[PDB]
Amino acid sequence: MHRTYSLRNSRAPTASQLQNPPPPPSTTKGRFFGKGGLAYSFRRSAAGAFGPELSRKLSQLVKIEKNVLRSMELTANERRDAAKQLSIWGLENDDDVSDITDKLGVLIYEVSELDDQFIDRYDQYRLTLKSIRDIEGSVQPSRDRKDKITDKIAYLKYKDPQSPKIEVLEQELVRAEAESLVAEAQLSNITRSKLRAAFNYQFDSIIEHSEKIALIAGYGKALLELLDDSPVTPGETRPAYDGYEASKQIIIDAESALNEWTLDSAQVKPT
Amino acid sequence: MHRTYSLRNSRAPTASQLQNPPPPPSTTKGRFFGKGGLAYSFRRSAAGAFGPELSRKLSQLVKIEKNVLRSMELTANERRDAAKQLSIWGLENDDDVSDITDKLGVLIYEVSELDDQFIDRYDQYRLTLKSIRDIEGSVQPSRDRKDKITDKIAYLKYKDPQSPKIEVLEQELVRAEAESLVAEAQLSNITRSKLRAAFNYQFDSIIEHSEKIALIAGYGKALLELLDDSPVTPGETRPAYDGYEASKQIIIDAESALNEWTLDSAQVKPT
Amino acid sequence: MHRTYSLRNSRAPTASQLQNPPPPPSTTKGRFFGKGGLAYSFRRSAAGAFGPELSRKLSQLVKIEKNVLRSMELTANERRDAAKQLSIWGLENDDDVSDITDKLGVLIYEVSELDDQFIDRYDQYRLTLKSIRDIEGSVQPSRDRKDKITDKIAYLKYKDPQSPKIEVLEQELVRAEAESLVAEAQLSNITRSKLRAAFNYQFDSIIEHSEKIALIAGYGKALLELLDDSPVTPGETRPAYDGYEASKQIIIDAESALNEWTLDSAQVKPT
Numbered sequence: 169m170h171r172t173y174s175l176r177n178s179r180a181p182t183a184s185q186l187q188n189p190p191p192p193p194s195t196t197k198g199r200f201f202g203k204g205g206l207a208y209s210f211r212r213s214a215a216g217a218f219g220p221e222l223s224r225k226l227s228q229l230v231k232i233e234k235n236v237l238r239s240m241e242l243t244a245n246e247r248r249d250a251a252k253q254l255s256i257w258g259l260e261n262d263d264d265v266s267d268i269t270d271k272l273g274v275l276i277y278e279v280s281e282l283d284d285q286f287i288d289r290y291d292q293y294r295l296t297l298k299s300i301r302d303i304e305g306s307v308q309p310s311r312d313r314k315d316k317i318t319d320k321i322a323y324l325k326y327k328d329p330q331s332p333k334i335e336v337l338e339q340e341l342v343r344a345e346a347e348s349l350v351a352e353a354q355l356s357n358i359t360r361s362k363l364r365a366a367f368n369y370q371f372d373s374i375i376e377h378s379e380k381i382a383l384i385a386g387y388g389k390a391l392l393e394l395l396d397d398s399p400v401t402p403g404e405t406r407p408a409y410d411g412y413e414a415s416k417q418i419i420i421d422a423e424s425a426l427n428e429w430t431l432d433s434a435q436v437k438p439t
Numbered sequence: 440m441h442r443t444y445s446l447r448n449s450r451a452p453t454a455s456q457l458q459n460p461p462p463p464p465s466t467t468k469g470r471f472f473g474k475g476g477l478a479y480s481f482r483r484s485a486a487g488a489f490g491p492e493l494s495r496k497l498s499q500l501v502k503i504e505k506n507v508l509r510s511m512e513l514t515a516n517e518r519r520d521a522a523k524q525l526s527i528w529g530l531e532n533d534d535d536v537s538d539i540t541d542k543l544g545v546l547i548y549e550v551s552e553l554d555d556q557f558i559d560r561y562d563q564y565r566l567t568l569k570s571i572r573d574i575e576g577s578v579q580p581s582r583d584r585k586d587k588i589t590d591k592i593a594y595l596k597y598k599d600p601q602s603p604k605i606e607v608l609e610q611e612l613v614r615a616e617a618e619s620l621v622a623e624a625q626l627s628n629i630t631r632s633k634l635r636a637a638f639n640y641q642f643d644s645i646i647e648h649s650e651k652i653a654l655i656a657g658y659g660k661a662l663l664e665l666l667d668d669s670p671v672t673p674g675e676t677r678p679a680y681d682g683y684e685a686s687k688q689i690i691i692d693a694e695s696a697l698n699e700w701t702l703d704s705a706q707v708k709p710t
Numbered sequence: 711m712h713r714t715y716s717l718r719n720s721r722a723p724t725a726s727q728l729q730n731p732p733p734p735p736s737t738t739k740g741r742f743f744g745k746g747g748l749a750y751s752f753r754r755s756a757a758g759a760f761g762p763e764l765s766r767k768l769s770q771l772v773k774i775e776k777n778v779l780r781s782m783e784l785t786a787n788e789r790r791d792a793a794k795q796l797s798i799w800g801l802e803n804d805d806d807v808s809d810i811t812d813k814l815g816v817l818i819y820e821v822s823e824l825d826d827q828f829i830d831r832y833d834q835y836r837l838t839l840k841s842i843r844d845i846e847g848s849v850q851p852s853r854d855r856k857d858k859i860t861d862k863i864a865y866l867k868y869k870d871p872q873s874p875k876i877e878v879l880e881q882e883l884v885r886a887e888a889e890s891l892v893a894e895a896q897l898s899n900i901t902r903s904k905l906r907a908a909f910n911y912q913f914d915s916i917i918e919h920s921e922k923i924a925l926i927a928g929y930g931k932a933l934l935e936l937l938d939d940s941p942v943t944p945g946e947t948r949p950a951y952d953g954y955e956a957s958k959q960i961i962i963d964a965e966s967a968l969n970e971w972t973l974d975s976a977q978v979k980p981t
Contacts, residue, residue, distance in 0.1 A: 173690050173711055174541040175523050175548065176530070180683075440819050441965065454972040455918060465833040467779050475784055496799040503792045508738050510785035513746055514778060521774045528767040533898050536905065543909060548711055562736040621944045627804055628941035634807070635939045638814065642927045642934070647726055649924035650978070656917035657980035660910060668906045670899040673892045694712065696981060701725040706977050707921070709928035710963060 208235050220312075223305025230301055233294045237287060244283040251276035264409040268395045271415050275388045278426070282380050289373035296366035300359060307355050314344040372431065379434050380426060387422040391415055479506050491583075494576025501572055504565045508558060515554040522547035535680040539666045542686050546659045549697070553651050560644035567637035571630060578626050585615040643702065650705050651697060658693040662686055750777050762854075765847025772843055775836045779829060786825040793818035806951040810937045813957050817930045820968070824922050831915035838908035842901060849897050856886040914973065921976050922968060929964040933957055 170179035181190075203209065212235075215228045251273045258269025321337050328334075394411050441450035452461075474480065483506075486499045522544045529540025592608050599605075665682050712721035723732075745751065754777075757770045793815045800811025863879050870876075936953050 169715060172687075173545045173694075175526050175544050176541060440816055441823070441968065451969075453969045454975070458973065461827070462830045462834040465779060465783065465830055466837075467776055467833065468783070473787060496795065500792065500796050500799055503788065503795060505738055507785060507788050507792055508736060510781060510788060512736065512739070514781035514785060516744060517774065517778045517781060521771065521778055524767065524774060525771050528771055531764075532901065536898075536902060540905070545711060552712070556732070559733045559736055562738065563733040566737075624942060624944050624946065627807075627948075630803065631807065631937065631939055632941065634811070635934060635937050638934055639931060642931045646924050646927040646931075649920040649927065653917050653920035653924070653976070653978040654980060656913045656920065657978050660913045660917075661980055663906060663910055663913070666902065666906050668902055670903065671895060673895055675895065677898070692981060697712070698722075698724045702729065704725070705924070706979070707924040707928050708977070709925060709932055710967060 220305050220308050222308045222311075223301060226297070226301040226304065230294065230298050233297065237291055237294060240283070240287050240290070244280050244287065247283070248277060248280040251280065262406070262409070264396055264411060267409070267411060267415060268392070271391055271419055272388060274419065275384055275391075275422070278384055278422075279381060282377055282384075286373050286377040290370065293366045293370040293373075296362060296369070300362040300366075303358055304355055307351055310344070310348050310351050314341070314348045317341050317344055375434055375436065376429075376431065379436065380429060383425055383429070384422065387418060387425070391418045394418070491576050491579050493579045493582075494572060497568070497572040497575065501565065501569050504568065508562055508565060511554070511558050511561070515551050515558065518554070519548060519551040522551065533677070533680070535667055535682060538680070538682060538686060539663070542662055542690055543659060545690065546655055546662075546693070549655055549693075550652060553648055553655075557644050557648040561641065564637045564641040564644075567633060567640070571633040571637075574629055575626055578622055581615070581619050581622050585612070585619045588612050588615055646705055646707065647700075647702065650707065651700060654696055654700070655693065658689060658696070662689045665689070762847050762850050764850045764853075765843060768839070768843040768846065772836065772840050775839065779833055779836060782825070782829050782832070786822050786829065789825070790819060790822040793822065804948070804951070806938055806953060809951070809953060809957060810934070813933055813961055814930060816961065817926055817933075817964070820926055820964075821923060824919055824926075828915050828919040832912065835908045835912040835915075838904060838911070842904040842908075845900055846897055849893055852886070852890050852893050856883070856890045859883050859886055917976055917978065918971075918973065921978065922971060925967055925971070926964065929960060929967070933960045936960070 170182070171177075172180050201209070212228060212231050215231045216224055219227045254276075255270050255273030258266055258273075260266075261269070317337065317340055321334070321341055324331055324333060324337060394414050396407070396409075396411075400406065441453070442448075443451050472480070483499060483502050486502045487495055490498045525547075526541050526544030529537055529544075531537075532540070588608065588611055592605070592612055595602055595604060595608060665685050667678070667680075667682075671677065712724070713719075714722050743751070754770060754773050757773045758766055761769045796818075797812050797815030800808055800815075802808075803811070859879065859882055863876070863883055866873055866875060866879060936956050938949070938951075938953075942948065
C-alpha cells in the first residue's frame with residue numbers, strides 16, 4: 169500500500185502520476201452490493217457457517233479464490249469477444265486502418281490466451297491451497313477430541329475425584345496430547361512447505377504473464393507507430409497503403425519473442 | 440492543591456502563570472446539574488443505598504470510576520473525529536497548509552490511540568479496585584455477624600442471665616471474634632498490597648502517557664516551525680512548497696521515538 | 711499512527727508493549743451509537759447542512775471541538791469527585807492508609823485543576839479557530855458573487871451577445887475578479903498565520919500539561935514508596951505509623967516543583 173501517514177484515502181503521486189494527472193474515476197461504478205449478485209455470497213456464507221471452525225477461514229478463502237477464477241475466465245472470454253468484434257468493426261474502414269485494427273485484434277487474442285494460461289496456473293495454486301485446507305481441517309479434530317476429553321476429565325474430577333474412570337480418562341488425555349502436540353508440529357511443517365511452494369508457483373506465473381503482456385504491449389505500440397496518423401486535407405485522394413510487409417514482420421517478431429521467452433529470460437530486476 | 444493561606448478561591452500564579460496572564464474561563468460552562476444527565480446519577484445513588492454499608496463507599500468509587508472511563512473513551516473518540524474532520528477541512532487549502540494540517544491530524548490520531556491505551560490500563564486499575572472492593576465487602580459480614588451475636592448475647596443476659604443458651608452463645612461469640620480480629624488483620628494486609636500495586640500501575644501508565652504526549656507535542660511544534668508563516672503581499676504569486684521531505688523525516692522520527700520510549704527512558708526527575 | 715504495512719488493525723508492539731503484555735480491552739465498551747446521545751449529533755448535522763458550503767466544514771470542526779471541551783470539563787469534574795470520594799473511603803482505614811490515600815486525593819485534585827487550566831487554553835485555541843472560520847466564511851460570498859455573475863454573463867451572452875447589459879456586466883465581473891483573486895491571497899495569508907499561532911498555543915499548553923502531570927505522577931510514585939506494603943502476620947499488632955513528616959515534605963516539594971515549572975524548564979527533547 170502507498171498511503172503516507174495521513175488520514176487521507178489518497179496516496180502521494182508516483183513518477184507516473186507526476187507525469188500526467190490521473191484520469192477521473194470510472195463512470196461504470198454503479199450502486200449495488202458491490203459484487204453483482206447473491207448466490208456466490210450465499211456460498212461464501214455457507215463456507216463461513218457450516219465448516220469446522222479452524223478450517224472455516226481457509227475454506228472461505230478457497231471459495232473466494234474460485235469466485236476470482238470464475239470472474240477472470242469470464243472477463244478473458246469477454247475480452248476475446250471484444251477484440252474479435254473490434255476488428256470486425258475495423259474491417260469496413262481504410263485499408264491501413266483495417267490492417268492495424270486486425271493486428272491489434274490478434275494481439276488482444278494473444279493477451280486473452282496468455283490470461284487463460286495464467287488462469288490455469290492460478291487454479292493449480294488454488295488446488296494446492298485446497299490441499300493444505302484439507303490436511304489442516306482434518307488435523308483439527310485431533311485437538312477437538314483433546315479439548316473434549318480434557319473438559320470431560322475436569323468435570324469428572326469435580327464431580328467424583330475418586331471415580332474409577334479418572335485413570336483411564338487420564339491415560340486417554342495423555343494419548344490425545346501425544347497425538348496433538350506433535351500433530352501441531354507436523355501441521356506447521358506442511359503448512360510452511362505448501363504455502364511456500366504454492367506462492368512461488370503463483371508468483372512465477374504472475375511474472376511470466378506480466379512480462380509476456382509487456383512484450384505484447386511494446387510490440388503493439390511499435391506497430392501503432394506504423395499507422396499513418398497524418399490527416400489528409402479535405403477533398404484530396406487517399407495515399408496508397410504499403411504497410412502489409414512491415415506489420416507482417418512485426419507480428420512475426422512478436423510471435424518469435426513470445427516463443428523465446430523463458431523464466432530466466434525475464435528482465436525484471438528487483439532491488 | 441496550590442491554595443495559599445487565604446479565603447480566596449484563587450491560587451498564587453506559578454512561573455507559567457507569571458509568564459503570561461491566564462486565559463478567561465471557558466465560555467462553554469453552561470447551567471445544569473454540572474454533570475449532563477441523571478441515569479448515571481441514579482446508578483451512583485443506587486450504589487450508595489443498596490450495597491453493604493462498609494463496602495458502599497468503595498462500590499460507589501468503582502461506579503464513578505466506570506463513569507470516568509466511559510467519559511474518557513467518549514472524548515477520545517470525539518478527539519479522533521475532530522482530528523479527522525480538521526484535516527478534512529485542511530484538504531482544500533494551500534499545499535503547505537494541507538500537508539501541515541494532515542500531519543497534525545496524524546499526531547492527534549496518535550494522541551487518541553495513546554489515550555485509548557491509557558484507558559485500557561486505567562480499566563485494569565479499576566478492575567483491581569473492584570477486586571479489593573469484593574474481598575473487603577465479603578469480609579464485612581463476619582463483623583456483621585459478630586455485632587449481631589454480641590447484641591443477642593447482651594439482650595439474653597439482661598433478660599435471663601441463667602439461660603442455658605448463654606454458654607453456647609458465648610462460645611459462638613468467641614468463635615466469631617477469633618474469626619473477626621484476624622480477618623481484620625488479613626483485610627488490612629490485602630488492602631495495602633492491592634492499593635499499592637494498583638496505584639503503582641496507574642501512575643506508571645499516567646507517566647508513560649504524559650511522556651508520549653509531551654514527545655508528540657514537541658515534534659508537532661518542531662513541525663509547525665516548518666510552516667511558512669511569512670505573509671505574501673497582495674497580488675503576488677504563491678511560492679512553491681517543498682516541505683514534503685522535511686515533514687516526511689519529522690513524522691518518521693516521531694514514530695521512531697514513540698517506538699523507542701521505555702519506562703526507564705522517561706526523563707522526568709522528581710526532586 | 712503506528713500501523714505497519716499489513717491489513718491488520720494491530721500495531722507492532724513498542725518497547726513498553728514489549729515489557730509487558732497489553733491489558734485486555736475495556737469492559738465498559740457497550741453497544742450504542744458510539745457517542746452517548748443525539749442532541750449534539752443534531753447540532754453537528756445542522757452545522758453540516760445550513761452553513762455556507764466552504765465554511766460548513768470549519769463550523770462543524772468548531773462545534774465538534776466545543777463538544778470535546780464539554781466532555782473534557784465534565785470528565786475533569788468527575789475525576790475531581792472520584793478523588794474526593796476515594797479519599798473519603800480511605801478515611802476509615804489504617805492511619806498509614808488514610809494518609810497515603812489522602813495525599814493521593816490531593817494529587818488527583820492537582821491533576822484536575824491542571825486539566826481545567828489546559829481546558830481554558832484549549833478553549834482559547836477553539837476561539838482562534840472560530841475567528842478563522844468567521845473571516846474565511848465571510849470571504850466566501852465574494853467568490854459566490856463572482857460565480858453567480860460569471861454564470862449570468864455566460865447566459866446573457868448565449869441569449870443575446872449584443873445586449874447592452876453585456877458591457878456593464880463584464881465590468882462588474884472584472885470588478886468581482888479583482889475583489890476575489892487578491893481576497894484569496896489575503897485569505898491564505900490569514901489562514902496560515904491564525905493556524906500556526908493557534909496550533910503553537912495548543913501544543914505549548916499540551917506539553918505544559920503533560921510535563922506537570924508527569925511530575926505529579928513521579929512524586930506520587932515516590933510517595934507510594936513510603937507506604938509500608940509489608941504484610942503483618944495473623945494475630946499480630948499494628949506497627950506505629952510515622953510517615954506524616956515524609957509525606958509532608960514530599961507534598962511540599964511537589965507544590966514547589968509545580969510552581970517552579972516554566973516553558974523553558976520542560977525537559978522533553980524531541981530528536
